[PDB]
Amino acid sequence: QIHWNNLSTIGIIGTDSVHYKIMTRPSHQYLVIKLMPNVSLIDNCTKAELGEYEKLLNSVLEPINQALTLMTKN
Amino acid sequence: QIHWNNLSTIGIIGTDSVHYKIMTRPSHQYLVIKLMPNVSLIDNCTKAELGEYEKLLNSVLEPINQALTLMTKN
Amino acid sequence: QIHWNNLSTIGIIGTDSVHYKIMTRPSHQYLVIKLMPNVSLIDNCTKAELGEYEKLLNSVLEPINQALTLMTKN
Amino acid sequence: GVVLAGAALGVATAAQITAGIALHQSNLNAQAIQSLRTSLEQSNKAIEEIREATQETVIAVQGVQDYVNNELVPAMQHMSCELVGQRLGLKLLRYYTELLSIFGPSLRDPISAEISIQALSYALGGEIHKILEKLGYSGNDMIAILESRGIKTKITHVDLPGKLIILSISYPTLSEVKGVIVHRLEAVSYNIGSQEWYTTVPRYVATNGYLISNFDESPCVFVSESAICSQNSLYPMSPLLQQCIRGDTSSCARTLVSGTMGNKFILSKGNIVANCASILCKCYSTGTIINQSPDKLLTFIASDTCPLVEIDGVTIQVGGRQYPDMVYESKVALGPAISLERLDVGTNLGNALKKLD
Amino acid sequence: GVVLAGAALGVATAAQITAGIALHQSNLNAQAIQSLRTSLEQSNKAIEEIREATQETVIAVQGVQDYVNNELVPAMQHMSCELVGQRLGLKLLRYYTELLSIFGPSLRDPISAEISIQALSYALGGEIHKILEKLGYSGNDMIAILESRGIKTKITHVDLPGKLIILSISYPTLSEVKGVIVHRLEAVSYNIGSQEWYTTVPRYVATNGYLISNFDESPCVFVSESAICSQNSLYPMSPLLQQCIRGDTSSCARTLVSGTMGNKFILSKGNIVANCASILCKCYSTGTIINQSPDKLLTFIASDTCPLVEIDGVTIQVGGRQYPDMVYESKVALGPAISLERLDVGTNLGNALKKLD
Amino acid sequence: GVVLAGAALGVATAAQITAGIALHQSNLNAQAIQSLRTSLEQSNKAIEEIREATQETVIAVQGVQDYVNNELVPAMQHMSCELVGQRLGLKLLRYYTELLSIFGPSLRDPISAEISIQALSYALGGEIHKILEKLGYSGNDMIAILESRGIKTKITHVDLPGKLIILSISYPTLSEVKGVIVHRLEAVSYNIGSQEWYTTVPRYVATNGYLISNFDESPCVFVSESAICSQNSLYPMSPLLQQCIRGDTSSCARTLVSGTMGNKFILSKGNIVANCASILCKCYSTGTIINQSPDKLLTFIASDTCPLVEIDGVTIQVGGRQYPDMVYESKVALGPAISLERLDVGTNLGNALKKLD
Q1: Is F139 on the interface with B (CB under 8 A)?
Q2: Residue D353: its chain E contacts at CB < 8 A?
Q3: Pair F283, F200 in one domain
Q4: Which residues constitute the signal peptide according to the record (chains A, B, C) (predicted)?
């Protein structure tokens, strides 16, 4: 298909030629990101940092949460 | 302001429109980078690595130091 | 060489002018990447992870290995 | 009196002059610098607030404190002094690698140097939020959340026996421009005959009164009220781009799709607009598919044409019509192709060069 | 019944509609969500397989488990609760920094969000291969090795009392296009008079039947059988580029070299082709150098001209001729210059602007 | 004898041929390889100097040594063998992730592969300076400081029972070109009527005798004597750029500002040059502001016009005049606009396409 005979006169030499594949998606799988570090082993520790992080989580999530409640509830 | 009526005929649909803010700088605050690890806890350790690092510090700093002495002393 | 007298009339002012050097390579030196973590200290541990990694190493290396055997043996 | 004499300096730029003037606004040289020096000896704190009389509070940073806090008593059997000496030597040389990457000789102009609070992270101990927390910002609030992008630092002073550099940071203080509205554009694909296309336009647009600007995507963050651009963001536009977004698509260019992927339908203002000459649009309660004129390029749907529509297995309830109806489009021109590959632009600028020849 | 009413939603795009439909394909809302909630309390596992009846197995992720596994009993003398509290507080704020970088407000459209399995690494615990290992892929096999580039994730659901987000990933399933062949091009330098040049062409080309496409280099990996492009990779080409690779070099552009570096020789199909009017080519057994016509631009070598050749200290054994011989080239044109610097293209588009004026 | 026969190889490039010849310069195959193998068993050192007779000293690298040095005796109660086995398994898989990123299948040509000493860091144990320190470079000296940018490595040999790869690095040896001078340009803003502009030119320029080249910014570091470019740096320029920097600004293009930011003043050779028709320039000892002709675009200041000047609250002492005085500028043309956005260049190349049509 390629007219290589015109190509080597200024030096075009294909060192590799392979096929091509694309991936398809027949099914799916579930994967839960639990943002909260589930480590009750903390022995009543990190309370303040986790308590600040709880509030952090509103600016983390809420925009997305609303974006998804607009898709669900309408 | 936007003539959207010409825009949807080839499908231009603005999913969000917000305002814009810019930050201003009324004042400043001081912040000292002490390049030297102030850990006398080292118990007479790292002496050789810190001693090499001392010399490193001349190529770290001096160019800038001169660049600043030209601004100050002239 | 530079006609700066035409350049400052719209404000072109060269704050620095230095020379230029290029590095040359008179000789070489040998450096062996041993991909295997040579830590027999492992005390019969990591056996499974290293055993999976052994196989990993075929897809790591072999393509290159062949690419080099084509250069050597021909 | 002056601190700035031109016949002895020779060459310096605008920001460098203003940085020198602001450095002389600091009377640290006038005041004894021993008090600053002698304060910083015993700080022994990652980030400390050392106040300075008739001046802002100095905040003192450290680099690597916690491991030295860790292995004093344990290492006496846990890890030998030399072993930990090698261990530290590793990190210290890594710290030197980082500081030589950023404070090193690739650093162009330390008088006008602008060093953002993000990139300094492992230099500033790997924590960025706590220092801004000291500044008095919650990170639960409007400034810390929207704007962590562009809190800038600059170099003020260098001392050699203290071996230290003195920076001064600014305060984020938000203020909106009077008539700035940011529109996030979006487009869907379509076809003409069998060819599949969509319109190539800037991701954002920004209008300040009559003036419409382009927009940056790297510092600019979107909250529900406004678009926060922590760095100066408003790079200009072109008339041959500014004519596109306002009122005409005769100049706006169009592209061919990436594989078979494209947006064949959309819901806007409660109305389904799509190209149903491409995929399956079928009136649900009636039970029949809807065809399209070949002199048309899309098809819009409101409640009155069909109340519920099926698009490839979905069930869409629509509302009232918010749009004018489809007038003919064949007397309104379409854009040229777009190829985002500088070799092609170069090849054709080299064609332009051939045309000049 | 519908979950999608247009008069109450107003605006949403194609991928967002399909994500909402696929979310309603999940009957998690229909089923009690307490069972999901109550399962995840005691998982205490970095990556666990929690099955869901008449549904795919849920895989549960964690972030930072191992240090909390480490310093319970030791820290009672090894590191104080506050000390470790500060220590954790550091990492936690770093974890918040990472999640605010990626799940934060720079994240544009969480309905249509496409979040690759690479970038989530420290969010997903810093290990990427093990989760795909759970999917049933060895990493010793054709899929895991060739394709780790583009295993994609999307956002499905958000729960506030569980404070958690539910994603669903896809399965890599490889399938080749019917008539796709990928050619990796390569070129050598040469000279005309003393000027040194080589040909500027796209690194890869891809032909699917008659159609020839351009190619991406960032996701596309090369195995000996095929070219694996895990993301949609086939961005289009231009006719004024597609005419170049097929059968003519009259339009293909040419460049000047970067310093003195260039490829003055090559072996292809057992044949040495080079410009021996530039460096030392000398017949080994005979003992004499070979010159070149000034109306020629290279020189090709097969066994019949000289069996073994010396090129600047080497000893090359060649084979039989696989090529037609050198016909004159002066009646076949050469390309224009190429400058890869948008200011130059801009300067000359600003020249084009001057020409328009 | 040869190691290179063309009829059995078929295809290989210039650098690949030279790498094979240099590999055969290594007589490791000729000599017993058992001695190399049997040396490396008991090295147990991150970076060791294993000498080879009539050859350069082999330097042996390791990856992850220190934690295995750490937790032998302690882990007997501190961390279970399986626990540490999981812990190691994590890092090992991370090490595999790094090596699969860099030695993996995105790695194009391992015969001609060029792998810089920066990117190999966590592969080479996360320390880069120590190996170069072994090479005999202080990091206190001219080579290590100026040039850490481009110390390159290449692949030489692969052994399967040792499972190892053998690289060979080069020695930085600095040598200046005979007539190379690097100028770092800089510009200030101005206005014409109310429009605000400044000149768009390449950040650096480099002149080698008559020849003037463009310049790269990514490897090239600046010391006070010279510009060190560790990688080949001298990418060419255009005549329609090279005419700009030498002696004329009739072709040099100009831009509109980013927000209101601009350089309205500068000190060069002890002379203040600015546009004082834009901001406040006021003679200090006299007490009056200075105006500007509307047929002029800047205003220059030496000692003779006013000895000390105030520019928005500063006090500037100037020196003797080092410049010719302001002749009229309205008979010297100005550049066209510049827009750095490839869509605009594409839109107008698509206009060029329309013009061709």
Answers
A1: yes
A2: 336-337, 348
A3: no
A4: none
Burial tier of C19 (Cβ tally within 10 Å: 0-12, 13-18, 19+) = middle
Q: Is E13 on the interface with B (CB under 8 A)?
A: yes
Q: How far is D29 from chain E (nearest CA, A)?
A: 36
Domain presence at residue D175: no
Residues of A in contact with F13 (CB under 8 A): 15
Count Cβ neighbours within 10 Å for each residue of D314-335 and write b for 16 or more, e otherwise. Answer: bebbbbebebeeeeeeeeeebb
Assess if residue F6 is contained within a domain: no
CA distances from E342 to D352, E348, F202, F213, F339 (A): 15, 10, 11, 16, 9
> CB–CB of E139 and C63 under 8 A?
no
Beta strands C16-24 and F226-229: pairing type?
A: parallel
Q: Are residues F24 and F126 in the same domain?
A: yes
Asked whether residue F136 falls in the same domain as residue F279, the answer is no
CATH for E180: 2.40.490.10
Does any CB of chain A come closer than 8 Å to the CB of residue E63?
Answer: yes
Alpha-carbon gap: E215 to the closest alpha carbon of chain C (Å): 23
For residues D336 and F350, the answer to whether their CB atoms sit within 8 Å is: yes
Domain shared by F122 and F226, yes or no: no
In a domain, A21, yes or no: no
**Would the CB atoms of C12 and F185 count as touching at under 8 Å?**
yes
Neighbours, chain F (3 or more CB pairs < 8 A): A, B, C, D, E
Show the tokens assigned to E187.
């070129």
> Is residue B27 domain-resident?
no
Instruction: Write down the residue that tokens 């819901």 correspond to.
Output: D267
**Total count of domains within chain C:** 1
How many alpha carbons fall within 13 Å on the CB side of residue E219? 22
F 149-178 residues with CB below 8 A of D? none
> How distant is the Cα of B16 from the closest Cα of chain F, in angstroms?
22
Contact criterion met (CB < 8 Å) for D139 and A63: no
**Distance (Å) from the C-alpha of residue E188 to the closest C-alpha of chain D?**
18
DSSP tag of E317: E
Of F112, F142, F169, which marks where a domain is finished? F169
Show the domain range for F94: 13-169
**Residue numbers in E near C58 (CB within 8 A):** 140
Residue A40 DSSP symbol: G
**For chain F, what is the radius of gyration of the CA atoms?**
31
Q: How far is the alpha carbon of E287 from chain D, nearest alpha carbon, in Å?
A: 44
Which chain D residues are within 8 Å of A52, Cβ to Cβ?
A: 139-140
Residue F136 sits in the same domain as residue F186 = no
| B60 is a domain residue | yes
Residue F186 to residue F200: CA distance in whole angstroms? 10
How many Å separate Cα D160 from the centre of its chain? Answer: 37
Do A12 and E201 make contact, defined as CB atoms within 8 angstroms?
yes
Could you tell me the two tokens for D1? 């009196």
| Domain range for A66 | 42-74
* Closest of F44, F45, D80 to residue C40, by C-alpha: F44
CB contact under 8 A, D253 and F317: no
Q: Please report whether residue E188 resides in a domain.
A: yes
User: Does E62 contact F at CB distance below 8 Å?
Assistant: no
Same domain assignment for residues F117 and F28? yes
**Nearest chain B alpha carbon to F317:** B74
Structure tokens at D41: 């000896």
Q: What is the DSSP string of B10-55?
A: TTB--SEEEEEEEEE-S-EEEEEEE-S---GGG-S-SHHHHHHHHH
Structural domains in chain F (count): 3
Distances (CA, A) of D7 to C24, D19, D77, F268, F322: 41, 19, 64, 10, 10
Contact between chains at F336 and E318 (C-beta distance less than 8 A): no
| Residue B61 belongs to some domain of the structure | yes
Experimental method: cryo-EM
User: In units of Å, what resolution does this entry have?
Assistant: 4.3
Q: Is residue E250 part of a domain?
A: yes
* Nearest Cα residue in chain F from B52: F140
